[PDB]
Design a protein around this motif. Sequence first.
Motif, PDB file in Angstrom:
ATOM      1  N   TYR A  65       0.827  -1.182   0.000  1.00 49.21           N
ATOM      2  CA  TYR A  65       0.000   0.000   0.000  1.00 49.21           C
ATOM      3  C   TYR A  65       0.873   1.248   0.000  1.00 49.21           C
ATOM      4  N   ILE A  66       0.712   2.105  -1.006  1.00 48.01           N
ATOM      5  CA  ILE A  66       1.490   3.342  -1.095  1.00 48.01           C
ATOM      6  C   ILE A  66       0.679   4.549  -0.642  1.00 48.01           C
ATOM      7  N   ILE A  67       1.129   5.218   0.410  1.00 49.07           N
ATOM      8  CA  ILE A  67       0.438   6.398   0.918  1.00 49.07           C
ATOM      9  C   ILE A  67       1.211   7.560   0.362  1.00 49.07           C
ATOM     10  N   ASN A  68       0.805   7.961  -0.820  1.00 46.02           N
ATOM     11  CA  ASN A  68       1.459   9.015  -1.560  1.00 46.02           C
ATOM     12  C   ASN A  68       1.459  10.363  -0.861  1.00 46.02           C
ATOM     13  N   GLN A  69       2.643  10.933  -0.650  1.00 46.69           N
ATOM     14  CA  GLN A  69       2.738  12.245  -0.011  1.00 46.69           C
ATOM     15  C   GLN A  69       2.895  13.316  -1.075  1.00 46.69           C
ATOM     16  N   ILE A  70       2.965  12.923  -2.335  1.00 47.84           N
ATOM     17  CA  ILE A  70       3.103  13.928  -3.373  1.00 47.84           C
ATOM     18  C   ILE A  70       1.824  14.752  -3.284  1.00 47.84           C
ATOM     19  N   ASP A  71       1.887  16.041  -3.611  1.00 47.35           N
ATOM     20  CA  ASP A  71       0.678  16.852  -3.546  1.00 47.35           C
ATOM     21  C   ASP A  71       0.162  17.242  -4.925  1.00 47.35           C
ATOM     22  N   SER A  72      -1.156  17.351  -5.017  1.00 45.92           N
ATOM     23  CA  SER A  72      -1.852  17.677  -6.256  1.00 45.92           C
ATOM     24  C   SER A  72      -1.330  18.862  -7.062  1.00 45.92           C
ATOM     25  N   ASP A  73      -0.566  19.741  -6.417  1.00 45.92           N
ATOM     26  CA  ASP A  73      -0.017  20.915  -7.092  1.00 45.92           C
ATOM     27  C   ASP A  73       1.432  20.725  -7.511  1.00 45.92           C
ATOM     28  N   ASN A  74       1.856  19.467  -7.605  1.00 44.79           N
ATOM     29  CA  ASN A  74       3.217  19.130  -7.997  1.00 44.79           C
ATOM     30  C   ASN A  74       3.491  19.656  -9.410  1.00 44.79           C
ATOM     31  N   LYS A  75       4.493  20.527  -9.519  1.00 45.86           N
ATOM     32  CA  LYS A  75       4.856  21.178 -10.778  1.00 45.86           C
ATOM     33  C   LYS A  75       5.108  20.354 -12.033  1.00 45.86           C
ATOM     34  N   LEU A  76       5.550  19.107 -11.887  1.00 43.82           N
ATOM     35  CA  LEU A  76       5.840  18.271 -13.048  1.00 43.82           C
ATOM     36  C   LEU A  76       4.652  17.447 -13.508  1.00 43.82           C
ATOM     37  N   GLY A  77       3.656  17.313 -12.645  1.00 42.20           N
ATOM     38  CA  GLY A  77       2.500  16.523 -13.013  1.00 42.20           C
ATOM     39  C   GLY A  77       2.574  15.137 -12.395  1.00 42.20           C
ATOM     40  N   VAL A  78       3.548  14.936 -11.521  1.00 37.10           N
ATOM     41  CA  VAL A  78       3.696  13.651 -10.867  1.00 37.10           C
ATOM     42  C   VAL A  78       2.395  13.333 -10.117  1.00 37.10           C
ATOM     43  N   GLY A  79       1.868  12.126 -10.286  1.00 38.83           N
ATOM     44  CA  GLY A  79       0.625  11.761  -9.615  1.00 38.83           C
ATOM     45  C   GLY A  79       0.617  11.797  -8.088  1.00 38.83           C
ATOM     46  N   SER A  80      -0.521  12.172  -7.503  1.00 39.86           N
ATOM     47  CA  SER A  80      -0.645  12.278  -6.049  1.00 39.86           C
ATOM     48  C   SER A  80      -1.540  11.244  -5.363  1.00 39.86           C
ATOM     49  N   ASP A  81      -2.221  10.411  -6.142  1.00 37.69           N
ATOM     50  CA  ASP A  81      -3.098   9.390  -5.567  1.00 37.69           C
ATOM     51  C   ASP A  81      -2.363   8.153  -5.031  1.00 37.69           C
ATOM     52  N   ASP A  82      -3.043   7.460  -4.121  1.00 35.77           N
ATOM     53  CA  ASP A  82      -2.546   6.248  -3.495  1.00 35.77           C
ATOM     54  C   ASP A  82      -2.712   5.086  -4.443  1.00 35.77           C
ATOM     55  N   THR A  83      -2.017   3.988  -4.147  1.00 34.28           N
ATOM     56  CA  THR A  83      -2.120   2.759  -4.924  1.00 34.28           C
ATOM     57  C   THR A  83      -1.950   1.579  -3.994  1.00 34.28           C
ATOM     58  N   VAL A  84      -2.769   0.551  -4.212  1.00 35.89           N
ATOM     59  CA  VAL A  84      -2.712  -0.680  -3.431  1.00 35.89           C
ATOM     60  C   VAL A  84      -2.519  -1.806  -4.447  1.00 35.89           C
ATOM     61  N   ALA A  85      -1.519  -2.641  -4.186  1.00 30.23           N
ATOM     62  CA  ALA A  85      -1.193  -3.761  -5.051  1.00 30.23           C
ATOM     63  C   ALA A  85      -1.451  -5.049  -4.291  1.00 30.23           C
ATOM     64  N   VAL A  86      -2.095  -6.001  -4.954  1.00 29.13           N
ATOM     65  CA  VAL A  86      -2.357  -7.286  -4.341  1.00 29.13           C
ATOM     66  C   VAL A  86      -1.771  -8.303  -5.293  1.00 29.13           C
ATOM     67  N   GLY A  87      -1.133  -9.326  -4.782  1.00 29.64           N
ATOM     68  CA  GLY A  87      -0.545 -10.246  -5.713  1.00 29.64           C
ATOM     69  C   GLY A  87      -0.404 -11.611  -5.143  1.00 29.64           C
ATOM     70  N   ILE A  88      -0.374 -12.576  -6.055  1.00 31.05           N
ATOM     71  CA  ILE A  88      -0.218 -13.969  -5.698  1.00 31.05           C
ATOM     72  C   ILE A  88       0.879 -14.569  -6.604  1.00 31.05           C
ATOM     73  N   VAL A  89       1.931 -15.034  -5.951  1.00 28.88           N
ATOM     74  CA  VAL A  89       3.098 -15.524  -6.631  1.00 28.88           C
ATOM     75  C   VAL A  89       3.467 -16.981  -6.520  1.00 28.88           C
ATOM     76  N   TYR A  90       3.639 -17.658  -7.653  1.00 32.47           N
ATOM     77  CA  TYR A  90       4.123 -19.038  -7.611  1.00 32.47           C
ATOM     78  C   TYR A  90       5.507 -18.964  -8.259  1.00 32.47           C
ATOM     79  N   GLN A  91       6.491 -19.634  -7.698  1.00 37.92           N
ATOM     80  CA  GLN A  91       7.787 -19.542  -8.314  1.00 37.92           C
ATOM     81  C   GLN A  91       8.609 -20.769  -8.097  1.00 37.92           C
TER      82      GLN A  91
END
Lengths: 340, 340, 340
Positions: B313-339
């Motif tokens: 789970y990424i708790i993005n601290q980037i802010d919506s007014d970031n000059k380059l356009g870097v995204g500010s929303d959170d992201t949650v990844a779920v995964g299942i791995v066989y190896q």
Amino acid sequence: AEIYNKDGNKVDLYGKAVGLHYFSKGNGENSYGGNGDMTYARLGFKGETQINSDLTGYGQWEYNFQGNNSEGADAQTGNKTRLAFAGLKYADVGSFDYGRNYGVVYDALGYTDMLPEFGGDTAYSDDFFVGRVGGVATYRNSNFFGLVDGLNFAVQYLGKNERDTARRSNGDGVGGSISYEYEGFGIVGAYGAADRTNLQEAQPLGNGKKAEQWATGLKYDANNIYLAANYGETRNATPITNKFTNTSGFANKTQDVLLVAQYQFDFGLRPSIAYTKSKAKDVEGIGDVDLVNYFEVGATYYFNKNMSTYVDYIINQIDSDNKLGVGSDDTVAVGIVYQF
Amino acid sequence: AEIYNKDGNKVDLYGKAVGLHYFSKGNGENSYGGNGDMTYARLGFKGETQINSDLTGYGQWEYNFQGNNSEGADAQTGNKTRLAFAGLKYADVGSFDYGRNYGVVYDALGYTDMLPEFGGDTAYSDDFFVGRVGGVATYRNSNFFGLVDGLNFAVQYLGKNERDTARRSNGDGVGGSISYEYEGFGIVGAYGAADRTNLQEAQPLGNGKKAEQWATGLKYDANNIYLAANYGETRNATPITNKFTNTSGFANKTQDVLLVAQYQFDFGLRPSIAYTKSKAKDVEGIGDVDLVNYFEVGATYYFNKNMSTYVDYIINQIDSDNKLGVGSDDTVAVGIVYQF
Amino acid sequence: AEIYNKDGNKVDLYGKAVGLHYFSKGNGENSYGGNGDMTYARLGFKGETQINSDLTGYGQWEYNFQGNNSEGADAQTGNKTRLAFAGLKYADVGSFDYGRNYGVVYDALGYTDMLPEFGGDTAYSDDFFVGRVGGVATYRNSNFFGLVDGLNFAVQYLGKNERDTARRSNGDGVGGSISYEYEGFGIVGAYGAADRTNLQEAQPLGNGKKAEQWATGLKYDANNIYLAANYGETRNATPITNKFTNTSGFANKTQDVLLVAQYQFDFGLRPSIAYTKSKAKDVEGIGDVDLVNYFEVGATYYFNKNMSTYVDYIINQIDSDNKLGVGSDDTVAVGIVYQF
């Protein structure tokens, strides 16, 4: 490496990781082999199953993964399946297979395709019967039905391949080879003719409605010594490009010579000396022009069957005033190979 | 999995199938990691042959097959060879290899590249010495010729790679690392500088004729605990894009910090807590701008050595007014791995 | 072939090299299956690890390498990952997996997807629930929690896949199947509905904001005999193209029928007889039009479990005046397969 063998079925999964680098001056645009990282890897499988005492089925697939691309958009540049075929071998009657495989004329050119990194210049891909092509049905006979030790032959049917490119296309054709091997010596004769496609005929260079290629080869392979020579010719089959005009097509005619001499020392070192020259005749516009012309000096050192390294050095005899724009600079290849 | 081992040659064929999904709001265009199916698989081989008691040869190839493309035209999107190299290790003298491999600065960044799904933000691909690059010759020494337990170093020569893209290109350069590991503790220092290509210099963002990257790392790895920290900087090496202007180039300067703390319970659960921040300085036009800035909370559960699942789970601290356009929303990844 | 099995983990590396050729008259543009070399190979892995007595983890990846491309620019044409998923099976509670896998409606269509080379015409790829799709989470239950022998069911969640193409795209949806198998007999019912994407809706053919597909199947599988039949329908799900207008979209409605009868002789020969017909209804502009309509006669001969060859012959019933431009010519496929 044979990773599987049970119930008459054995699978050999094989491959190699080749760290490779070419050294040529300039942007290697005018050199023989280019310049820079040329790293790559191979992965393939060869399977063989005993259906019974006289009958064997088998199949093979080999792929090429370039190791010198970025993980970006160019990531797939140069990747391709080299071989993909299945077949059956029956007693002394012969074998038959179909798929992407080597043209029959390569039964000859194979003699001198033994340099550490370069060589085998006339054995082009998707070029009728000289190198790997798609859709070829091949019948091969060994020891003349088992009646004549050392006498083998093959006939091959090439099906039409109309690709988006004149260079990678071909019409129907047939080819065959006959070779004989007696105690270290081997002699071969190979020949094939095929139809050229509309697109091939619409090309600026080369004129005809049929492509031909034949080569003969002679070799002495024994006592740590390997000497081999090939001579062959072609009509409207060899692809060429005028770098000046940016024109393309096929050489009306070519006469090709390849010689190779190598020796395998007991400690692992295998020096190589070779000479190659392919000259085109009657090129529409230029007349006679050399396409390939050099001496090679090189050496491979085998640490064992899985590891080796080599340096291949091309002493380009092509001259700077070559009419087609063929490069005249030298190239040195250094490489380190792990394989299984 | 070691599928072969005979005659001093052992081959380990390995791979994994990763069912993966990212959850971010919107079209994940403004989120940290995107949104949707991110399924993929890996296949690779690692070979090692004992040429004799002091000498070992080895090679490795690893490929990435995306599992979230259609069987249509986009089928190859994201596929690529990650590693491809061959080498030799001799007694206590060191090892040497060449091919596509990890830059030396990653000898440092590797410390904190341990998150379940994200993390390692500064270890970009085809970006000089920080991640995987092509055409690098690497010499590595362990235990200072066997005279100093725990003291290792490496030097690496990067050859020019002039690709069609400024982002995936590089000129010649050299880099090295020195690290020391004493009982759970490890400290590293890594640095590399290289030439930038014409095309890199023709870019709108970033100014210089030389790229630099250095990072230091510190870690405590023992007793089920893993704590690590990295700090590094770069000049004209980190790639950035102004989403507004659609401009691109490299950050004149960056200061990067990464921290990671994890614990491995005996029953299989490995919680993770991390913090990452990469800020660019003197960006032509914007001034100072954060490129990466977040907290991570996540966990991996190992069923055994072949099966696991995790949520990152990424708790993005980037802010919506970031000059380059870097995204500010959170992201949650779920995964299942066989190896294997 | 199971190349690895140690510590409760077994890996089966499998693949095949298929020499294949299609014979149709003309440029096979108006025939059922085309004409020419169709050689290809497959490589994949299936892994399964016993986490404990009730819990099993597993994963699978399968790739398709075309063997009929040149080593030129077209080298990658048709290559793709077919399957890529990981999952867990727990006691009698069921299994769950996620990744690129088969839609649930294929639980039905699989009944008649048994022809030597052709058949399974309605089981399209990246077409909601009928064939292989990306991003599907599938739960499957066997023997109703172990309480009812032979009664199984499955539910499947399809996540939105917004691709650059309307044909390879899909919105969210759910589907399920219920099947029952009693002594040679098997009956199945499958159904799924999903959202269509903006782009799918912007297409010229087909009208709706939801896609549906259901199929039922019946089979008798025992005593060397295999008889199977499927019937299903669809709304705005089947992709169609008007070759005249070069228009594309989905069939408002289709009614599909498939029958198959085969017999396996003890000596290796397996003759096949089949009938397939898929007709579209209410196509905007054409009215009712057949999409698929033919009889199949074919045979496979198994030399053993690793080698076989077959001829599949399609007696196309489509007629030359077919409104969409669907081809009316026959096609004969011959192939030789090696596999492990």
